[PDB]
């Protein structure tokens, strides 16, 4: 609709005021606006476009296709950094990150997985239980394409106060993963 001059003056910059005046006298008040279908000229959100958002708007002085600056008036003289920093928090984290060091050993993983899968107490596992590997070997399997090697570990865990368990673990990738699986199984077999 149409607004009086002062009401816009308080709510808008002075330079934009003359544009709004010419728009007011240019567009009839009885105008009917029909939404476009094929081409969406406007943004999905609502904006008065009066202020420049550093991320969502072209940086002042940055050269680009629609640079309205005089060709030798660009104000970008240090190119070391990324010119337009991220908005909001400054970060683009997903809804839940899972990076314990970058999010914006055997005993610990064993304890956590065991508490998750069976309800065993992590603290008891980490503090009281002690593991010694008993058997560590490499076992092979023939196959039509070739020979496949795997690592077998047999470990014994115990709190030295009457609880003892035996665990066996297999891993084609590495012996450490086999020891991890053996520790897991031994904790399960206490």
């Amino acid at each position: 609709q149409h607004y009086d001059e002062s009401l816009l003056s308080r709510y808008y910059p002075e330079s934009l005021l003359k544009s709004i005046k010419l728009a007011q006298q240019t567009i009839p008040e009885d105008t009917k606006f029909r939404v476009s279908r094929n081409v969406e000229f406007a943004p999905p959100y609502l904006d008065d476009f009066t202020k420049i958002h550093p991320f969502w708007d072209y940086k002042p002085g940055m050269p680009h296709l629609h640079a309205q600056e005089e060709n030798n008036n660009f104000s970008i003289f240090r190119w070391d950094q990324v010119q337009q920093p991220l908005p909001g928090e400054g970060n683009i984290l997903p809804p839940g990150v899972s990076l314990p060091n970058d999010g914006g050993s055997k005993s610990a993983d064993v304890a956590a997985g065991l508490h998750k899968q069976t309800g065993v107490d992590p603290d008891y596992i980490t503090r009281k239980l002690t593991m010694k590997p008993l058997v560590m070997k490499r076992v092979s399997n023939q196959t039509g394409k070739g020979k496949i090697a795997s690592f077998y570990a047999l470990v014994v865990v115990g709190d030295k106060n009457g609880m003892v368990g035996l665990g066996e673990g297999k891993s084609r990738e590495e012996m450490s993963k086999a020891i991890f699986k053996a520790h897991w199984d031994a904790v399960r077999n206490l």
Partner: protein, 263 residues
């Protein structure tokens, strides 16, 4: 605003301003850059603003990268940046916002240059010239000009008009009564416009001349128009008039709702 170019005026400025002016002068000058007294003295003051010793800034000013050297790959992702493709989408949206702001607050300022359309009076402005302009291109067809006129509006009597049509030959179309000429021989379009206008004056002058001219007994030739029309499809037919039966047309039906809404 000519602060960067003259070395004299760095004194008293905010530290970031001295630093930005220093960067500006160095970047703009490039190879022609040379050390200056006042820029160094101003830079001496910038030691407090950032973590730099005074001799260190002297050294860095004097000998660039190497002075500083004398004094990463596959890094973890901090979720502080976008991919290139997402940045392309953000650039698209930046362009969209630029155009939206432009339409919002500068296009309303182009109404001050409106002017009313003084229609060229149809009878006394009968000749239409077509000029073409390929914007942002060096296209040879930008030199073509087309002069077209409906032959009736030409000021001519029956014998003179018949002579005009006879001498037009293939340039005249009897069905549409249009005389059209195309000129692209000269380099510019203005030269072709002058050429077409002069040929029109010659044609008109010698058509209006009937003193020693006897082209009344020559029938108008239309074989070129016949061929041109023969190379097009025709939809001349129309639904027979007597076949129409308006009796079966839909009859609008009374609905009291709009009657009471409007009265």
């Amino acid at each position: 605003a000519d602060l960067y170019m003259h070395p004299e005026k760095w004194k008293g400025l905010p530290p970031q301003r001295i630093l930005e002016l220093y960067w500006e002068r160095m970047a703009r000058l490039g190879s022609e850059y040379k050390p200056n007294k006042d820029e160094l003295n101003a830079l001496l003051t910038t030691s407090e603003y950032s973590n730099v010793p005074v001799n260190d800034i002297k050294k860095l000013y004097h000998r660039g990268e190497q002075g500083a050297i004398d004094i990463n790959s596959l890094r973890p992702f901090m979720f502080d940046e976008l991919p290139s493709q997402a940045q392309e989408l953000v650039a698209q949206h930046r362009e969209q916002r630029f155009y939206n702001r432009l339409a919002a607050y500068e296009l309303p300022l182009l109404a001050q240059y409106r002017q009313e359309y003084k229609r060229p009076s149809p009878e006394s402005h009968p000749v239409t010239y077509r000029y073409t302009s390929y914007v942002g291109e060096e296209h040879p067809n930008s030199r073509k000009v087309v002069l077209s006129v409906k032959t009736k509006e030409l000021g001519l009597e029956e014998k003179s008009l018949h002579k005009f049509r006879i001498l037009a030959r293939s340039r005249y179309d009897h069905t549409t009564d249009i005389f059209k000429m195309s000129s692209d021989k000269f380099e510019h379009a203005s030269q072709n416009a002058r050429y077409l206008h002069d040929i029109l004056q010659r044609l008109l002058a010698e058509s209006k001349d009937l003193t020693e001219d006897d082209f009344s007994d020559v029938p108008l030739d239309t074989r070129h128009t016949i061929a041109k029309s023969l190379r097009k499809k025709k939809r001349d037919y129309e639904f027979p008039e007597h076949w129409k039966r308006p009796e079966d047309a839909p009859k609008k039906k009374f609905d009291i709702v709009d009657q009471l809404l409007s009265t």
